[PDB]
Design a protein around this ligand. Structure first.
Ligand SMILES: Cc1cc2nc3c(=O)[nH]c(=O)nc-3n(C[C@H](O)[C@H](O)[C@H](O)COP(=O)(O)OP(=O)(O)OC[C@H]3O[C@@H](n4cnc5c(N)ncnc54)[C@H](O)[C@@H]3O)c2cc1C
Ligand SMILES: O=CCCc1cc(F)cc(F)c1OCc1ccccc1
Lengths: 661, 132
């Protein structure tokens, strides 16, 4: 439906109020069911009006004129709902033409560290709300980990490049606001073994299915066998897959032993039967000799001599009957023994070729999580799964940077300004920063509040890139330690001509060892100009950063030559290699749910810091230091949309604190 | 509840995780275990192949022809004398006794046991059989 789709597109249950709405409308959620339904319709309809045209500001006055009775009768209720949606960034976020131009009386001063997407989204909101906002950016550009290479006609993304499903995704609204050339990613992805030959269709499917079953199995291992701690340490997805694979290899050997044991039991039953026959044959042989001697006593004979012939005769036919039955049983057993000898269970769980293809699927997962599987929390690594959007994944053909660049229009952004120190007190904050081009030029920024959107990699640095005075409390630094910050790199290859399959957006290279499974394992055809992207995932990410570009490009061309032929692959005209772990403004690619961590650490990351009183015995200070970024949003970590959402969240939180709700 | 064709018992999980090298040890002992079962199959195949070679010829040089005799009702003296000896040797095995005489049904043998019980000391004869 329509108002129902608006709720779904806003990641909201249409028939129930959220925790956040309860907080702002406690009178309604604690009240009768009828008013809750009126509220829910007002909310869903206001969302719909915004979504149905997100290029212009949805004002309260405009909203009321479009509501119909009975819902437009409590105008206080409508105004409250509208302002709630506006403040929390569910309507009038991103880039929209403003009806009422921004009032000149600016209230409050906020410094935002970082002008990636989270920092930018917050800044736009905070400006919309009337605050004075300045962003401090270390790099010479906006976007952070949204980073588009551009040279000539070549456009290729070194960071984020995929928009997940548009259903429920706030990037959908942004894509109606910015010219993004979104294109579906066809998921078909042929694999080529290390020798350049394609993986036959039978094997690609057998192993993908086994890969999926191995994952299920670890989840069984996690939930049903409570196998979550081993040797006093948290179990990882990697360990669990080892244990599952070891047990499938064990079951194959158990099945082999059971099989040959049925052969031994049967051979032995046959040995005992044969021994019974050679003895019976000898007994028959000797008895026949007796019958022969007795019947050669020519008649006329007395009746004992006759009894001897006739009873040896009878005794002999009985033994022959006994032997004929034992030979019928010998055929029944030589049957079982030949059927068994022809039904041997599987020889191996996975062949070497199998295991290598399986490793490509593991590398593909190491890609998705930007980390070796031995670091992923078995219990929690797929906790954001029940929030996946609906729809096809897409790429940004004109380069994802079009989004942060667009968001930056109109904001006060100081580029080439590396924050070194964040000072926060009961009376306000001071951010000390330097010019990255001459670190001696020092800058002091005084403000009411600091929104920190530094990447989790930067927060993790020892010794620190950015000092907090006073230091961050233990509950926050402990979260920063536990959370994973992973790594993932790309090689952009610009050719003058297309030698790959044009109707194929992905193809895989199957590395020959487990160790190297992440090394150039996947290639992307995403752009208009002939460009291939190559991924380095897992353990290979960090190791390939200490290898020169010329060698990395060399390894690529070697792989592609094997798949497409040596004559078909010219030298690239341009090449770029990302090194995200070494990037001091990133120190990795995105967060992952590490063993020993969990979803609650993402909440901890988002909790703002409140300084102590200046004067002792003085009233409780307000919070001064806020946090956003992909590492701060439990349900959508490690994404652009997750970062965007986290900025919208904090802007609402900051504005609630400094402008009043 | 594990996926079909996955095998994951609590028992086996602990056996493969209780130690740093538990897994490879477990699988090594199953490798040697399988080796010694295959070794044992080889010895029996060869033992049985030798036994089959002794049964070369079946029992065919030793099977007599199967004669049928019209089951007659009258007891010749010679047929009575065969029964008494067959009792002495086979006891109450009425079938074997019939097969020896040739032309006497199982029942006819049974009837013989009573009608000539007195005159042939059949009781003494059965006692005589039970000694050896
Ligand atoms: C290789 C790669 C592939 C990815 N692919 C997927 C994908 O395709 N789709 C997707 O949705 N997401 C993907 N992501 C994740 C996504 O890019 C990020 O989650 C998101 O862009 C990060 O946003 P953020 O605003 O939290 O952080 P950032 O964009 O990192 O912003 C923080 C900013 O702070 C700046 N900064 C750092 N230190 C200082 C300092 N001392 N002083 C001042 N400024 C400083 C940084 O330079 C940066 O501009 C990918 C990321 C990478 C790197
Ligand atoms: O290019 C960088 C990939 C960034 C990324 C990080 C995420 F945490 C979630 C994503 F959706 C995502 O991008 C698409 C993707 C989806 C599934 C598996 C792999 C990638």
């Amino acid at each position: 439906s329509g108002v129902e789709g608006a709720a779904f597109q806003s990641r909201l249950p249409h028939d129930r109020m959220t925790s956040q709405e309860a907080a702002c409308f406690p009178d309604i959620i604690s009240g009768p069911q009828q008013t809750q339904k009126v509220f829910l319709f007002i909310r869903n309809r206001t969302l719909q009006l915004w979504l149905d045209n997100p290029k212009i500001q949805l004002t309260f006055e405009a909203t009321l004129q479009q509501l119909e009775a009975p819902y437009n009768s409590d105008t206080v209720l409508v105004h409250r709902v509208h302002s709630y949606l506006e403040r929390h960034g569910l309507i009038n976020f991103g880039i929209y033409k403003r009806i009422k131009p921004l009032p000149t009386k600016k209230t409050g001063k906020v410094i935002i560290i970082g002008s990636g997407v989270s920092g930018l989204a917050a800044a736009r909101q905070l400006q919309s709300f009337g605050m004075d906002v300045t962003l401090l950016e270390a790099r010479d550009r906006v976007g952070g980990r949204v980073a588009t290479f551009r040279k000539g006609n070549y456009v290729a993304d070194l960071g984020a490049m995929v928009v997940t499903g548009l259903g429920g995704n706030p990037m959908a609204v942004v894509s109606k606001q910015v010219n993004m050339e979104l294109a579906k990613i066809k998921q078909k992805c042929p694999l080529y073994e290390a020798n350049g030959q394609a993986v036959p269709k039978e094997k690609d499917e057998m192993v993908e299915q086994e890969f999926n079953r191995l994952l299920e199995a670890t989840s069984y291992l996690s939930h049903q066998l409570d196998f979550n701690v081993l040797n006093n340490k948290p179990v990882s997805l990697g360990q669990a897959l080892e244990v599952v694979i070891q047990l499938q290899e064990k079951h194959v050997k158990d099945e082999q032993i059971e099989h040959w044991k049925k052969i031994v039991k049967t051979q032995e039953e046959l040995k005992e039967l044969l021994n019974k026959m050679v003895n019976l044959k000898e007994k028959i042989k000797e008895l026949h000799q007796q019958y022969k001697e007795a019947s050669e006593v020519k008649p006329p004979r007395d009746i004992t001599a006759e009894f001897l012939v006739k009873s040896k005769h009878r005794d002999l036919t009985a033994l022959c009957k006994e032997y004929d039955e034992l030979a019928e049983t010998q055929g029944k057993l030589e049957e079982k023994l030949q059927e068994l000898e022809a039904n041997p269970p599987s020889d191996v769980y996975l062949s070497s070729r199998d295991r290598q293809i399986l490793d490509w699927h593991f590398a593909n997962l190491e890609f998705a999580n930007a980390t070796p599987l031995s670091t992923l929390s078995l219990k929690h690594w797929d906790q954001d799964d029940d929030f996946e959007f609906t729809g096809s994944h897409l790429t940004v053909r004109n380069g994802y940077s079009c989004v942060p660049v667009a968001l930056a229009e109109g904001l006060d952004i100081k580029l080439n300004t590396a924050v070194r120190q964040v000072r926060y007190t009961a009376s306000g904050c001071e951010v000390i920063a330097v010019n990255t081009r001459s670190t001696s030029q020092t800058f002091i920024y005084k403000c009411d509040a600091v929104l920190c959107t530094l990447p989790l990699g930067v927060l993790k640095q020892q010794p620190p890139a950015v000092q907090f005075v006073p230091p961050l409390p233990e509950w926050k630094t402990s979260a920063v330690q536990r959370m994973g910050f992973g790594n993932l790199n790309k090689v952009v290859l610009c050719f003058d001509r297309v030698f790959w399959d044009p109707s194929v957006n992905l193809f895989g290279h199957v590395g020959s060892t487990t160790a190297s499974r992440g090394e150039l394992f996947l290639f992307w055809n995403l752009y208009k100009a002939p460009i291939l992207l190559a991924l380095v995932a897992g353990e290979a990410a960090g190791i390939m950063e200490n290898i020169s570009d010329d060698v990395i490009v060399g390894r690529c061309l070697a792989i592609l030559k094997g798949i497409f032929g040596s004559s078909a692959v010219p030298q690239p005209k341009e090449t770029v290699v990302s090194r995200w772990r070494a990037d001091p403004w990133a120190r990795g690619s995105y967060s992952y749910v590490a063993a020993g961590s969990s979803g609650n650490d993402y909440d901890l990351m988002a909790q703002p810091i409140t300084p102590g009183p200046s004067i002792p015995g003085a009233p409780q200070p307000i919070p001064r230091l806020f946090f956003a970024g992909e590492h701060t949003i439990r349900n959508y970590p490690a994404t652009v949309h997750g970062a965007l959402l986290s900025g919208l969240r904090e802007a609402g939180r900051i504005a609630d604190q400094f402008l009043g709700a | 509840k594990p996926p079909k064709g996955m095998f994951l018992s609590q028992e086996d999980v602990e056996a493969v995780s209780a130690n740093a090298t538990a897994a490879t040890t477990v699988l090594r002992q199953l490798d040697m275990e399988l080796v010694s079962v295959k070794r044992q199959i080889q010895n029996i195949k060869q033992t049985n192949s030798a036994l089959k070679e002794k049964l070369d010829g079946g029992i065919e040089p030793y099977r007599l022809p199967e004669v049928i005799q019209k089951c007659n009702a009258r007891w010749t003296t010679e047929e009575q004398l065969l029964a008494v000896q067959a009792i002495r040797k086979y006891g109450r095995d009425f079938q074997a006794i019939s097969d020896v005489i040739g032309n006497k049904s199982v029942v006819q043998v049974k009837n013989f046991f009573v009608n000539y019980r007195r005159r042939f000391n059949i009781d003494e004869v059965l006692q005589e059989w039970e000694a050896e």
